[model samples]
Target chain A: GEELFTGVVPILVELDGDVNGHKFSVSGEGEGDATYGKLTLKFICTTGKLPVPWPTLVTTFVQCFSRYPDHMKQHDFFKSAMPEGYVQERTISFKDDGNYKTRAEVKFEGDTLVNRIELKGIDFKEDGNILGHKLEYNYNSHNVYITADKQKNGIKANFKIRHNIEDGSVQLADHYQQNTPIGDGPVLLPDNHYLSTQSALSKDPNEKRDHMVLLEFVTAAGIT
Target chain B: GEELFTGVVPILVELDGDVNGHKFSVSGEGEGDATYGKLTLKFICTTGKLPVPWPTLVTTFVQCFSRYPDHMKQHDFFKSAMPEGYVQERTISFKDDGNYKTRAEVKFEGDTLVNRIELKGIDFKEDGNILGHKLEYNYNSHNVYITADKQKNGIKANFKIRHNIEDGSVQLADHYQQNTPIGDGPVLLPDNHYLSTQSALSKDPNEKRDHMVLLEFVTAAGIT
Candidate 1:
């Protein structure tokens, strides 16, 4: 066995409502809490026509972050951006957003009639190590991978988005590995692995793009 | 012929020394005169671990905006966040940034080798309208397209980015339509199309997100 964590042990404090179990607030102890730092997200929706498909893009995004894993999966799927085509299912084999940062691989399948399905910008992180990272989309490939290696204060992620114009089908996938701080020997950590995959379609002319995403969080030796 | 223009014709004013053919302001009746209008561009580069391929993503962006039809054909163009393979060449047959808001079909070819080649963000403005819009990056498709159709003092634009995975490559593609606000027929108006694309790649990882942008000058279609 070896050391499980280094630096500070990130925290998750819930209030009265105890809403979505988001890992931790890297910015502050609480908003305006004289904390050393701050966590901020600025949103500006200027002028535009249609944003994305509708209920799917909008509703799912909130669910993916709030519900996640099981509940998130059953949150009712919606799609209307296409006659384009879509990938039917996906299996995310591994994910670790904690210390190990996690690496995940996802496989996808679609009906022969489906032309293309594209999932736009989705970033998932259950902990502090991996920031909200996302992938570009797969033109047509059945596989995708994602991971975060190299640890400083945090880590940099690597993504592989595959496509095959030859088939007009797109696949999604991802993978990740734990970056341990070099312990004495074989360190046994809890399997805090997390994985999920989501997809959708579009209505553009003859373009088929697939959204393959693999998100995970693992421990160098599984922390408590 | 149908009526071509409206309001006062816009002019390009030379400042101080008036360097390049450009290097001047697209505003007012005179440089120092009080014409009450101006178009300017200011640039400042600070960050970068270093990115963009040889020509296409770089020089070609400029060349395309300049020549568009005749020369853009030359601009050419990935990563780990990379895959096992990618494409070799891109064949973009149609793009409209125009009236039909022309949607096009493009083709791509790739290799068993060749490492990383990024197409950076490239905008195709074949039209005079469409802008103020963007996508969050397709979750599935390697070919991502973004558009905005609206009317205002300034118009919007749409763009599509195609990528290959087998060999690690990115392609530039687009299509659009020109919106004539007047009692139209075939109106040959002064072409004030200004197009530019800014894209950056991170050695990071999956997030090949593009900032589909719109840089336009509407000559105060209402500006006094």
Candidate 2:
């Protein structure tokens, strides 16, 4: 098999949230309530027909409360949680390959999470430039962006967890602490896509644990 | 979401075989044997770019002893087991929507299993046309095609099981008895693809049981 190592790292984003063992109420004064359950954040980043690899593409996907744990209770969960709808865009700065300064952005709509990234010099041991150094823990029951770190010349894009637990007016929301650094390297999927599975530290058997978020980057095999 | 109710029926093929409880030996007297494992058959059929919905797409996928159970031990088995190479074609006949007359064929190469099917008048409710009355239990430790049935207007394409079990000059080989007919109707996948999960009647708790095969069909959402 010829290795289609095109020297460019195509990056796709994914968010997998598991309730682990904790039983907490959804922090908003809304229809959401407490019940051991999990939700997934959905999005799509593409330039056109093919997936945007290097140099970046801006895209968004919808995540609705009506779709998650209910619609997919049929078969085991392996499907990409991508919903189609309108998108909002933002403009910001980014670091390419941990060193090269570049442009990026993040936006949010009523229930939509949008992202546009640039990965020019980033070759997929990955990570290192800070995402313009900003932290918005939107604790009012909305999408939050933790640390979009790119340290040590590799990439650990961002750690995002979608929740039905709205933060509302609460000062303290569902906060997650990073146990360790991102995974070491990227692996390949059965469909020839690139995948990297990284997990934060867990707690003792009897203790409640933080939910694990799964990040997947889908890259194309095009030549340089 | 508007339902794309195209009245024409499109059928695809899949082969999911588990070793169940009992352990058996590979019958062929070649470079194959087994402890406890499984293998998947691969193929593809399309008239062009879009999946050949309705009428059918005669496709073939490769399943090598070195691929399955091993190549996919990375992340649970959710990827499609499709391998590509050279394909050999064969001509045969089939039943459209269980009652209409149609044409089809199946061919095999070293590790390649090829199939060409015609689903002219079949609607998705499915089945009742015997696949032009032919039964060849090629029990030589290779791709085997069992009852391609279409009873009561619903379709149960074919039951295929791939193995590394080689059957040399031995008389009695791996003979599998159909415990029950194919599933009742088709369900949908997260990607909006059509899926159906049916299990054969299992055995008593103390006894060994037969392997279960999963069938999947990819369809287009063009309204008729």
Candidate 3:
């Protein structure tokens, strides 16, 4: 049958390591398939606070690509039930070196919740790299459904986001090895870790960028 | 201790009623404390499509009042973890009769997800009404966390939305009587139903509006 409805695939991926040996640890937790895309997550530094300024700037970068769902254009009940529609806008994080064009929109009212981002001019068959860049331009687009609330234990955020990565990337290597978590545990634990110390041997300033990420697959839950 | 984090509060509310003898049914399901605000819901007509066209226009109307959250201004991890900032935009559903001011924005990428809406110029002491309007202007403002996915069973949408209703409304009536669900069972069953057919004797076109609703409370789940 045609895919009429979509739900939330809960997942939590925790990343620990360092960017150029800065000793930063960030946990990515939320909903989605840890192995692939369709993920909605947040970065929590169990160590407290993200280690870089780009994190804020990075947010401005990805915000350039997020867009409202095409389905919303057809589903009228969504508007009828909630009476809230998508609001479109754009942002520019880095203007000089990189010009990443993107937009994001969202609506939360009654029972309708939508958060999305879509980057234009993506080559489905090209390498995942956009403009041949490494960090920010890897993924092409993201679509997610979000549900969050204030509860007893923690602020539980339940969401699923879909990533439209360039097909060339998936064909070359295991995407989850670096970005998402894999394996299983009592819940989902990091079964593998990847560390690159290339920056340790580099003489250039900006070239000294080392990265490490621990990937694990955890259990799923119905959004609280 | 202080509340450091908040999570998703999943819930579902369904209603079946006839206005002036015209049969109509709607199911409101999503997250939040089904009893109070912080609810993100959607109306589904199991019978098929929404019986009215206001659903679409209603969406636009709500768009006028929904705005970004005040917390986003402080949470930098949100800007750092995902590197996708919030996008603000507005919508107008009715111009002549109701001038509801609202805006909604959203962002999704990697593992970071944010969807929020806040309406301004609201009187917390006044009854749950903006400009003293019903239907579209009843609830004050809604804040929600959503996690939705393209899954197997159905589109499993896990979310928690908060409603900021007027204090006057809560002090007087059992707010949930007509809006939310209350009870328990295998899950949550519609324990009671309310039906009004005042329009049955009305000759006016717009005045013939009778309403019906069924309320129930169910168990919660971690976002899938």
Please give the CA lDDT of all the candidate structures.
0.19, 0.19, 0.23
Candidate 3 regions with alpha-carbon error over 4 angstroms = A1-23, A30-42, A51-224, B1-25, B34-42, B51-224
> Which interface RMSD does candidate 3 score?
29.1
Residue ranges of candidate 1 with Cα displaced over 4 Å: A1-173, A176-198, A201-224, B1-156, B174-224
Predictions in order: chain A TM-score: 0.20, 0.19, 0.24
Lowest summed lDDT over 10 consecutive residues: which window, candidate 2 chain A?
Answer: A26-35
Q: Which scores higher on lDDT, 2 or 3?
A: 3
TM-score of candidate 3 relative to the true fold: 0.25
Candidate 1 lDDT for residue A20: 23
Q: Give the per-residue lDDT digits (tens) of candidate 1, residues A1-224.
A: 00111112222111110002222111111110001111111111112211221211211111011111222222111111111211222121113322212111111112111111122222334331123222221122121221222232112223333322213333223422222222222212212322222222112212133221111111111112
* lDDT of candidate 3 over A9-103, digit per residue (tens): 33233344332234445444344321211234444455654343222112211110111133222211112222122222222222122222233
Q: What does candidate 1's lDDT look like per residue over B122-156, in tens digits?
A: 24332211121221111222221212222311123
Clashes of 2: 33
